[PDB]
């Protein structure tokens, strides 16, 4: 099986063999685990000040003055309690919280490969959120050479059929709902296509477009492949990147790709096949259950038990 | 009121399901549970139960122990609901047909270069779902180092070692040492 | 994650699983490991034999790499030979061309005798041998050598 390769015009111009990294099993659980750990490794620490609440002078007045026993400032004002106005925190936050998390190298690689495998399905890409109604193929390889003007980059995206995804991103810019707009996160835009390039100057023509991201094929980012921790991203591939993918996995040293496995479609097929149906065997018939009623009421109800009639009816 | 206490015991909880997030495990479990439901076959019953265990109840099996176990019945299919590892201390491996959840790479290469077969459980469920000419096998569930410390070292009938480091002598030189 | 933990399923329960008669106080037993001979003696004797006292000679400074001593069994000797030449060595068993294995090159000093060797002559060069390692090797037709 071979992927198609289209021009910057829309016509079909080449065939190229499938890279093996798309044959890896689909693991939403592993992608969620890695996405969590790595996205949590990007944080900036925060903490309250270490002197806060404790710069004033306060001591307890003791019993015998008809007041509660907390420490008090000269004059009698409450202080040094978490329940006093102007006191310290009960357990102040501290920067020695462990902010990062560790992930093994195989697990990181496996998450990248499962995200790429998900990217090559016309069903998970449509179920993730992108608009793929007018695309020729989901492994989408287009020869572009060098794009330097946004107008020509938009022209290619139109000529291939990814124009509604970028318009979805463009017409969704709004101001977010909460406190987050006081903290340099005022606007939200949706996400569209990801362009992966190898030898070809494209960033200067694609970057401006809303909802577009750039990734050089030798260093692929899981947070870009699975935004929101949802795997199937729409990827516009350069010919050179799509042709150097296998070289990249060969450059990974003492590493082999994980073994491909079957799907619930394959289990379903096996079970309904004849080699498994030939060994079935029917169960015994179930009990027959009625609701208790008084046989002595009438003649037929009694005659279910004793038909001869020796027992009187009532 | 009714008396449902005397002569009756507390009910029991066991794993009716695997709690793995792995879709391969979940699918193999549902499939073999269906086969049990429709055929009987305590073989499929035991296999369905074994696919629910907790990975300390599923030790590994080595090719050397398997060769020893399948000796003089070499024509039967060994079934292992765990990983098969390799044993470099056995210079020559015989030809065997093994079916396992996972194989190591070196184990797969040694089995194939001997001439035997490496099967999966979907392979097993397609070619033979009820285990005619299969043998279920498992490893030493009490091979863990953790299970060697259970008990009361210090009690005079224990035969179990203590846990940390103990540099003294009181109670450590036999009876009549306290 | 704070949102999946036991402690927050106790909101509205006053004491938080610590009891009304007993309660949660600062240090109702003392701090650390104190009391092991007096009021924790039942624990210390049940679970920690030989925790108190003294045993044996003491060295004021141990030489870690003098006392270092790696070891290999004879059931492992044939796995140091790469995989692609054992078949040949086994087929053409030779008194005149025998495999020479030097185990200090692999980082072992003494050779012990657990297991067995294949029926094939072999020279083994180590720095010290055990009695039954020598026995089994000289029984399969190998030779023990001492290496500098």
């Amino acid at each position: 099986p071979t992927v198609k390769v289209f021009g910057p015009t829309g016509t079909q111009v080449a065939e190229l063999p499938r890279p093996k990294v798309f044959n890896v099993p689909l693991r939403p659980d592993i992608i969620n685990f890695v996405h969590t750990q790595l996205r949590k490794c990007l944080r900036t620490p925060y903490a309250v000040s270490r002197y806060a609440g404790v710069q004033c002078t306060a001591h307890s007045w003791g019993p015998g003055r008809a007041v509660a026993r907390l420490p008090r400032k000269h004059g009698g004002i409450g202080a040094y309690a978490n329940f006093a106005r102007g006191g310290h925190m009960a357990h102040p936050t501290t920067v020695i919280r462990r902010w990062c998390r560790k992930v093994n190298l195989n697990q990181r690689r496996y998450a990248v490969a499962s995200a790429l495998a998900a990217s090559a399905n016309a069903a998970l890409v449509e179920a993730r959120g992108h608009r793929i109604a007018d695309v020729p193929s989901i492994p989408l390889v287009v020869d572009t050479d060098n794009v330097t003007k946004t107008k020509d980059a938009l022209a290619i995206i139109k000529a291939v059929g990814v124009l509604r995804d970028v318009e979805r991103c463009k017409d969704s810019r709004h101001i977010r709902a909460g406190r987050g707009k006081m903290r340099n996160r005022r606007y939200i835009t949706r996400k569209g296509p990801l362009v992966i390039y190898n030898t070809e100057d494209v960033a200067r023509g694609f970057r401006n477009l809303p909802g577009v991201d750039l990734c050089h094929v030798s260093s692929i980012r899981l947070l870009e492949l699975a935004p929101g921790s949802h795997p199937g991203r729409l990827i516009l591939w350069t010919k050179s990147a799509f042709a150097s993918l296998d070289d990249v996995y060969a450059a990974k040293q003492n590493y082999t790709l994980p073994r491909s496995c079957i799907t619930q479609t394959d289990i379903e097929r096996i079970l309904q096949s004849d080699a498994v149906q030939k060994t079935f065997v029917p169960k015994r018939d179930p009990l027959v259950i009625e609701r208790k009623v008084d046989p002595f009421s009438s003649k037929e109800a009694l005659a279910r038990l004793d038909p001869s009639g020796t027992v009187m009816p009532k | 009121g009714i008396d449902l206490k005397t002569g009756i015991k507390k009910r029991k909880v066991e794993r009716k399901e695997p709690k793995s997030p792995n879709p391969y495990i979940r699918l193999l479990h549902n499939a073999f549970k269906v086969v049990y439901e429709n055929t009987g076959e305590d073989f499929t019953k035991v296999l369905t139960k074994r696919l629910c265990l907790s990975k300390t109840n599923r030790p590994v099996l080595s090719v050397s122990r398997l060769a020893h176990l399948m000796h003089k019945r070499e024509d039967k299919i060994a079934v292992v609901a765990s990983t098969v590892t390799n044993d470099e201390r056995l210079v020559t491996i015989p030809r065997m047909t093994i079916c396992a959840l996972k194989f190591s790479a070196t184990a797969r290469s040694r089995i194939e270069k001997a001439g035997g077969r490496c099967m999966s459980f979907d392979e097993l469920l397609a070619e033979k779902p009820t285990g005619d000419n299969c043998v279920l096998l498992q490893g030493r569930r009490s091979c863990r180092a953790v299970c060697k410390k259970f008990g009361s070292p210090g009690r005079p009938n224990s035969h179990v070692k203590p846990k940390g480091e103990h540099k003294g002598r009181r109670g450590a030189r036999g009876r009549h040492s306290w | 994650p704070t949102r999946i933990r036991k402690s927050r399923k106790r909101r509205g329960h006053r004491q938080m699983g610590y009891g009304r008669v007993g309660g949660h106080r600062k240090h109702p037993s003392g701090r650390g490991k104190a009391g092991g001979l007096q009021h924790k003696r039942t624990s210390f004797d049940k679970y920690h034999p030989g925790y108190f006292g003294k045993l044996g000679m003491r060295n004021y400074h141990v030489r870690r790499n003098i006392e270092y001593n790696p070891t290999i069994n004879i059931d492992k000797i044939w796995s140091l030979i790469p995989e692609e030449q054992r078949d040949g060595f086994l087929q053409r068993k030779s008194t005149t061309e025998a495999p020479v294995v030097d185990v200090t090159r692999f980082g072992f000093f003494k050779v012990l005798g657990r297991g067995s060797l294949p029926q094939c002559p072999i020279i083994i060069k180590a720095r010290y041998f055990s009695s039954d390692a020598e026995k089994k090797l000289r029984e399969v037709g190998g030779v023990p050598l001492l290496v500098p």
Partner: peptide
């Protein structure tokens, strides 16, 4: 009956008074 190995960790020193004994690694990428 608790069967645990005794922790061999030293008590913290100078946590709020003396010289700063806590070294962070927020600067290693820089």
């Amino acid at each position: 009956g608790r069967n645990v190995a005794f922790s061999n960790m030293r008590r913290y020193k100078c946590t709020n008074k003396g010289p700063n004994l806590i070294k962070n690694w927020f600067n290693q990428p820089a």
